Amino acid sequence: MLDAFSRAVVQADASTSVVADMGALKQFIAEGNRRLDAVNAIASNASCMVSDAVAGMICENQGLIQAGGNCYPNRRMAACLRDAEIILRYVTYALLAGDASVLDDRCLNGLKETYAALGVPTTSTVRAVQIMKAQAAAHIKDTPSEARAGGKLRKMGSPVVEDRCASLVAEASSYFDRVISALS
């Protein structure tokens, strides 16, 4: 796998040239502590996120838990919970690395085809990923609502700035969006 820095190196090696622009990478370092917080905000809340996302996928499409549904029986519900957590885990890998390659290589490649063979509806999967995308954004910004959290509300306590890590939110989102692209 690659990270933000080895990505720049691979692009430089394509022309057998030294890496000259180290500005975008200097900014990577400058926002390093932020990035660490964003990963911490997802990892720390992963279990709540996954269960709430799969439960939300289900409450929006009851067919999933009725007769013939792909979250039925217990074995399938458990497999689905597992998958949502796997996808979230590789997304957090990508965010910590600053590069999608670990997500592409080890999670998304061949996944659509795997689900097709199995009959796992990619559309419901996309929805669970959409919910996790929204969860992640709010945890990174440290602005989760009580409405969506209940007694499970967590606050991260990271040092606040006006943009609330807008760029990292966008980056995190792009990774979820890669998942969604891959399953469509």
């Binding site: 690659l2 820095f5 000259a20 890998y93």
Partner: protein, 164 residues
Amino acid sequence: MKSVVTTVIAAADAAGRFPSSSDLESVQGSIQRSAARLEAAEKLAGNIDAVAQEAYNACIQKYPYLNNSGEANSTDTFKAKCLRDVKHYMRLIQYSLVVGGTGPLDEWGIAGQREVYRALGLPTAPYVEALSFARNRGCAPRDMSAQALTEYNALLDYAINSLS
């Protein structure tokens, strides 16, 4: 490709783990150590031709026989390739300084190097000498900060050991 972050990601994935405490700490290391190694990377970026040229000159100076007929520095094509090889290593070192792991040097320089040089009958002592000259050449703060020089020298010694 091996870096601080890909190493801990790879270990977490083998165990099916989210990034945890020790993974974030490891990456904090990258944040701290990046200034020194990126300093060296920028200096190398701006001056790699001169750095490589003098390291190449030194290995030929050590081993004049290389210029003799049938030897590895004896023709114009041979001379140009030897200097180019020296520059390859410095560029891979530049890459490794940016990444902060030996990844680029492992994969694109060291892997297969023994087999290539054996096959072509290229002696390994002049490679070592060119890298050894470069290793002993720098001083701080003239060339770069002391910690930048430490990062620079560490990758040169890494390459030297891979040939020894």
